[PDB]
Structures are given as structure tokens and as C-alpha cells.
Amino acid sequence: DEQPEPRTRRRAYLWCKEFLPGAWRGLREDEFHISVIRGGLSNMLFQCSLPDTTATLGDEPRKVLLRLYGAEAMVLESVMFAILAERSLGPKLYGIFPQGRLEQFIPSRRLDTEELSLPDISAEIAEKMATFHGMKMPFNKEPKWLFGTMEKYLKEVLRIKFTEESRIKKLHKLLSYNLPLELENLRSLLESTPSPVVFCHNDCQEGNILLLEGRENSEKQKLMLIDFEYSSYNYRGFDIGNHFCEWMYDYSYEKYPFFRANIRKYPTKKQQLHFISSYLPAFQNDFENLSTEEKSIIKEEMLLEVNRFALASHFLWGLWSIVQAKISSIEFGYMDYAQARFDAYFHQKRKLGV
Numbered sequence: 001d002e003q004p005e006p007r008t009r010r011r012a013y014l015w016c017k018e019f020l021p022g023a024w025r026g027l028r029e030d031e032f033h034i035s036v037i038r039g040g041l042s043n044m045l046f047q048c049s050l051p052d053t054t055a056t057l058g059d060e061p062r063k064v065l066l067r068l069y070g071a072e073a074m075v076l077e078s079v080m081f082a083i084l085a086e087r088s089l090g091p092k093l094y095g096i097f098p099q100g101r102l103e104q105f106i107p108s109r110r111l112d113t114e115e116l117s118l119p120d121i122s123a124e125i126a127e128k129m130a131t132f133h134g135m136k137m138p139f140n141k142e143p144k145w146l147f148g149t150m151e152k153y154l155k156e157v158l159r160i161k162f163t164e165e166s167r168i169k170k171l172h173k174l175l176s177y178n179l180p181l182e183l184e185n186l187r188s189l190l191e192s193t194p195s196p197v198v199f200c201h202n203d204c205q206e207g208n209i210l211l212l213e214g215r216e217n218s219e220k221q222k223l224m225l226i227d228f229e230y231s232s233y234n235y236r237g238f239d240i241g242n243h244f245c246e247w248m249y250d251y252s253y254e255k256y257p258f259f260r261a262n263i264r265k266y267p268t269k270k271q272q273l274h275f276i277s278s279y280l281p282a283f284q285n286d287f288e289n290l291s292t293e294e295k296s297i298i299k300e301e302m303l304l305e306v307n308r309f310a311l312a313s314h315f316l317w318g319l320w321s322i323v324q325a326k327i328s329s330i331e332f333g334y335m336d337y338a339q340a341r342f343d344a345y346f347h348q349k350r351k352l353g354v
């Protein structure tokens with residue numbers, strides 16, 4: 001288990017000792033256990049724990065996750081995390097301070113891309129998302145996030161000047177589509193596509209879904225959605241369409257560009273209907289008491305809705321990725337990823353006949 005540098009060890013020890021109750025309060029520095037869960041320059045994660053020989057005094061956790069930010073948004077993100085914790089839809093919040101958070105450590109692993117298509121996994125994600133979508137949050141209810149964000153990235157993308165030859169050639173090719181005009185065409189399409197405004201996760205990818213340890217038996221209760229940093233009131237179609245897009249991207253791929261894209265992994269009509277068939281009863285509650293006529297019309301229109309909004313997933317994350325090619329320190333093939341998203345966008349446009 002990778003040890004942090006002595007300084008980070010000492011800081012982590014002091015936060016745990018001061019924010020956590022019970023046996024943590026009298027812990028000595030020499031008794032403190034910590035290891036790295038994820039390095040990097042931002043959102044460093046560590047597991048912190050009591051010695052195995054140390055007894056708890058009450059209901060304090062034996063193990064916690066320390067999240068360190070590194071290099072209004074903090075207020076919103078913080079309040080949102082605390083509310084989800086109170087409602088048991090996220091990890092408990094044990095401590096909050098300018099440099100990070102102490103969270104409940106959830107014994108689990110992330111799902112892999114291939115698991116998204118498993119019937120039981122997909123059905124639970126649908127149910128979890130419908131729950132997420134149904135609740136009240138003290139945030140702006142106007143759906144300006146989607147196009148406001150897309151405009152913001154496009155404005156930045158148009159200003160970008162690369163110096164390295166590969167990035168230069170790639171940006172040229174992406175620019176050749178006339179993105180401002182394409183954004184306008186997308187805007188018009190989505191304007192004519194009704195979709196309820198709900199509290200969306202906005203990044204429901206496999207890496208943000210935990211498979212809970214000790215619960216492979218549980219058909220319906222084995223997942224937790226995490227990482228709500230992008231969450232906002234947004235069109236329901238975006239959340240679902242974005243999730244469907246994520247079937248096609250595997251970020252665990254070990255060589256450059258550090259992802260694999262496969263267009264044929266997008267869910268089939270059957271797979272899509274299985275997802276929405278689980279979503280709709282969880283979101284509407286009495287949905288199954290409607291006529292087969294009405295149920296089918298709702299389902300068919302919803303397929304249209306989410307598949308059109310999947311275009312915005314491609315366009316938004318495509319633009320985002322170009323910006324990250326300029327600003328991010330992370331080892332990821334951002335320009336290659338942007339091209340993959342735009343390739344999918346035009347493919348999806350062709351499939352839809354739009």
C-alpha cells in the first residue's frame with residue numbers, strides 16, 4: 001500500500017483526529033494508517049483507518065476516505081454532497097474543510113464498461129437515476145446548464161492556439177465541421193424535442209457507479225451512483241442519452257490515448273427499451289396502470305428524446321475534451337477523444353436521419 005509523503009500523512013492525521021469522533025480523538029500519529037487510493041494533482045484520494053487492534057468507542061467508522069482537492073461551485077458541491085448523504089443516496093459526510101472532505105469509505109469497486117449492458121445492472125441504474133431525477137434540490141431550476149456549458153466551451157475552443165504538430169492537425173479537422181453552425185442546428189433540434197427538466201447527474205458513466213461489496217446476490221439493490229460534481233437541473237434526455245453514450249467508451253484501456261471507443265457497443269433498441277422500462281415505473285409510480293397504447297407511445301417518444309439528447313452528450317464532451325487538451329495535466333488522449341465523440345455525433349445524426 002502506497003504511503004503518502006510525511007507531510008500529507010501528518011495533515012491527514014490531524015483532520016481525522018479533529019473531525020472524527022470516538023477512538024479517532026485520542027489516536028497518536030504513530031498509530032495512524034493511511035494509503036493512497038488515487039494520486040494525481042487534483043482529487044487525491046486516500047483511505048485512512050484505525051489500527052485493527054483499536055476498539056471503537058461508539059458508532060464511529062473504522063475507515064474513511066479522505067478526498068483532497070489539490071489544484072460558488074464549492075458551496076453548491078458541498079451542500080449537494082451533504083444532502084445526498086442525509087438522504088442515504090451517497091457516502092456519509094464526516095468532515096469538510098478548505099482542502100477537502102472526509103467521506104464514508106464504501107467497500108466496493110467501480111463497474112466496468114462491459115457491465116453496463118447486463119440486464120440487472122442496467123435496470124438498477126435506471127431505477128437509481130429515476131430516483132435521482134425525482135427529488136428536490138435547492139438549486140436553480142432553469143435548464144441553462146446544457147447550452148450555457150456548450151457555449152462556454154465553444155467560445156474557449158475558438159480561442160485555442162496549439163503549438164504541437166499533432167494537436168494542431170487534429171484541431172484543424174474538428175474546426176472544419178463549423179462548430180458554431182452545428183451548435184445552432186443542435187439547438188434547433190433539441191428545442192423541438194420535449195424533455196422534462198429534472199435534477200441530473202450529468203456524468204453517469206461506469207466509473208461513477210459503485211458495485212457494493214457483499215451484495216452480488218441482490219438483484220435490485222447492489223449499486224450506488226457517486227461523483228456528483230457536474231450535477232445540475234437539466235433535461236432528463238441528457239442524463240439518459242449520456243448514459244447510453246457511455247456504453248461505447250472504455251476508460252480503463254492501458255495504452256495511449258487511454259480509452260477505447262466502439263460505436264457498435266451503443267445499446268440496441270431492445271437494450272434501450274429495457275432501461276426505459278425500468279426507469280418509467282420508478283419515475284412515475286403508477287405508470288404500469290396506463291393502457292398499453294399509452295405506455296407504448298410514451299416509450300417510443302422517450303427513445304426519440306434520449307437518442308436526440310445523446311447528440312448533446314457527444315457535442316458537449318467533444319468540446320470539453322478539446323479544452324482539456326489545452327488545460328489538463330492528466331495523461332489522456334483528449335484530442336483523440338474529442339474526434340471520437342464528434343465521429344459518434346455525425347454517426348448518430350445519420351442513424352436518426354437528422
Ligand SMILES: CN(C)c1cc[n+](Cc2ccc(CCCCc3ccc(Cn4cnc5c(N)ncnc54)cc3)cc2)cc1
Pocket residue numbers: 038045065091103104105106107108110203207208226227251317332
Ligand atoms: C466528463 N467525461 C465524459 C469524461 C471525463 C473523464 N474521462 C477520462 C477518465 C474517465 C474516468 C477515469 C476514472 C475515474 C476514477 C474516479 C474514481 C476514483 C475512485 C472511486 C472510488 N470511490 C469514490 N468514492 C468512494 C468512496 N466514498 N468509498 C469507496 N470508494 C470510493 C470512484 C471513481 C479516468 C479518466 C472521460 C470522459
